Amino acid sequence: LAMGWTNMLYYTRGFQQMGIYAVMIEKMILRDLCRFMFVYLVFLFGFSTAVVTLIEDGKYNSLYSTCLELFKFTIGMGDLEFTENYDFKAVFIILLLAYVILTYILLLNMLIALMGETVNKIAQESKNIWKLQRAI
Amino acid sequence: YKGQTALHIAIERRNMTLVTLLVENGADVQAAANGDFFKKTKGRPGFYFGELPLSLAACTNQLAIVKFLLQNSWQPADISARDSVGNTVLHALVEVADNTVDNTKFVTSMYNEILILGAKLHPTLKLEEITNRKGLTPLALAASSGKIGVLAYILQREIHEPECRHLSRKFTEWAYGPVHSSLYDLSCIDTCEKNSVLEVIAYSSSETPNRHDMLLVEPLNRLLQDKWDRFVKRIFYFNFFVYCLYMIIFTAAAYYRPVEGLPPYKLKNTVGDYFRVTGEILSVSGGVYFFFRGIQYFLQRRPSLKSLFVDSYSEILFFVQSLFMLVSVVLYFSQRKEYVASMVFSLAMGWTNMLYYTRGFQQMGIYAVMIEKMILRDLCRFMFVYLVFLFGFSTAVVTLIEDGKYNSLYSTCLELFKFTIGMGDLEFTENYDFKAVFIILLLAYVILTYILLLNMLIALMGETVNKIAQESKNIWKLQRAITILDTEKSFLKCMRKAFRSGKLLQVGFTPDGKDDYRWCFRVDEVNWTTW
Amino acid sequence: YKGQTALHIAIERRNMTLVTLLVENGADVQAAANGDFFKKTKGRPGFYFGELPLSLAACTNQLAIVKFLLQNSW
């Protein structure tokens, strides 16, 4: 059901503006989202493993839970205090702050800038791709 | 000034009559002006030219005067002369160039003319292997000094001159119509065992004006790509896989660390415990390996203690990971719990060091270079300003708060920081008086940091992206070149195998009856225009 | 290479005299150079032109030579 609903974009061809917009979306998902996802996933897995290792025992003593909790930061929902079951609170807070600075502050903003450049660069190519799609 | 002799002044004055009038009656022509005004240094800015009358005439672009050499009523003007630093005329020419347009143009033209005349007068002499006190050939000096224009000139030299064309460096083999194949000499570029253009450029200090743009010259780029595709691609992929496997084992070992207290911990006779301990051993061994590798790099390269913390971030990061691992082991055997903290620090650093291998894939390598530049410039500036703002307003707020949980600098600073990540509260406490002041302070802080500075950070990064495309690509190319050079010097699987290029007899005959082989390198080219 | 005939070389050399000297006395003009150097593929980069003397002259942009077609002693 979800795949079918999201496949409604296919028909956006046949309307020049929305067709070009859909082509923009393709190109973005192909290049920028891919690169950012690779780097960000490496970062997230690394820091998540470190954090779970630090945690002594409790609800968040599993890789899945800690990974989800670290990911919650990316969507503006981080906690910075989601657990206390550990020692050496300084290390925990240092790790969380480093992860925040590296991913949220830097990489997301970089994603916005790279997309902006991409938009600035692929106007004519997007229009031509839309024309080819309509021809097909 | 110490050698402003009559002929010196005449040449500096650029007159064709006084020079000749001195030439007659045998004016001395081997005087060296070692005056402090004639040396190289910023103090009392003078004009270094080579210290010899021939060199001076050359630096002044006096071709007309030149060709006075090897005449009568005259004294020797050996092209193989040497000053107090051993520089020849060619060395002076490379020194004077400043990578401008006209300067390049003239300097290359002269350099040529002197080459041809020297070949004519003494065909049995070999200029370009002459070396100075530093032992650097003029090509080597240019490579190590930042003069891109001359590098491009020499490396693409052509002299279609019937009797002494052998000095040329670029050759054309066959033209079966519109497509023809050319040869580029490799001698003293990839393998010299004393000084090679590639090794010099790669390991050149950070102060070189054009270290990045040097590799864009034709021959160098083709050679690096060729070596890559030949063997470095596979060697690098193998190294990447090994590092990934080591990281996986380290993570697995750390994850299952026992929780009993006061290490070291007794080894129960079990399969799982056995796997944990062997994984530990593997991880510690990898840490030792990286530590020794970093030590070897530090001793072999011998950084000048300034570029040490300014270049080679990757070496520093790997060495720091090794240090954390080793300290973790030391504590683990010292009966302390902090080995866990050291272990997690090392684990996170190692995982985030996986970006290093993103070189070897053009797109991701350029992306990593973008990330570097951003962290270096934009993140730094924003962090400084934002930290000043945050500390100021945090101190003000904590002062305002009367007493309670948030009556400490750390807690209030954390609470104010929570705003930056879209988690602010605006009501996290009420223990105070004068709520208007509190809300005013919080609103001012929000407006100044969240609304303004973050958005400004996005805009500045956008500008940076728009500005550093080509530089990022060039930096990635340099990184890959350094990787190729290390790998080749590593003897990991080479052992002088994995050869470099093909050999040919290109001249047919040198000026002497003997022939020669010049270790050439082929690159086919096709052109329609210019039949 | 398999068909580097005299006229082939002359055309590749782009001279108006050798071509005519071969044209007289009826030089053959339907030779196909199926040499591996004259085929299409990356290995041993050569120059594919069509494999025929007319095609070769065309790929070389020799209009002057062209229009030699449909003449005598030919």
Author numbering:
A (entry chain D): 545 to 603, 627 to 703
B (entry chain A): 199 to 603, 627 to 752
C (entry chain D): 199 to 272
Publication excerpt:
The capsaicin- and heat-activated receptor, TRPV1, has served as a model for deciphering lipid modulation, which is relevant to understanding how pro-algesic agents enhance channel activity in the setting of inflammatory pain. Identification of a pocket within the TRPV1 transmembrane core has provided initial clues as to how phosphoinositide lipids bind to and regulate the channel. Here we show that this regulatory pocket in rat TRPV1 can accommodate diverse lipid species, including the inflammatory lipid lysophosphatidic acid, whose actions are determined by their specific modes of binding. We captured several states of TRPV1 ranging from channels in which the VBP is empty to those bearing different bioactive lipids, including distinct phosphoinositide species, brominated phosphoinositide analogs and a pro-algesic lipid, lysophosphatidic acid (LPA). Together, our data show how the VBP accommodates a range of bioactive lipids and how occupancy of the site corresponds to the structural status of the pore.
To visualize the lipid–channel complex, we added LPA to nanodisc-reconstituted TRPV1 and determined a consensus cryo-EM map to a resolution of 3.0 Å. Through symmetry expansion and focused classification, we captured LPA bound within the vanilloid pocket in multiple stoichiometries, ranging from apo to all four subunits occupied. We thus refer to these structures as ‘empty’ to differentiate from the ‘apo’ structures, in which an endogenous lipid occupies the pocket. With resting and fully liganded structures representing closed and open configurations of the pore (S6) helices, respectively, we examined intermediate conformational states associated with substochiometric LPA binding (the four subunits are denoted as A through D in a counterclockwise orientation as viewed from the extracellular face).
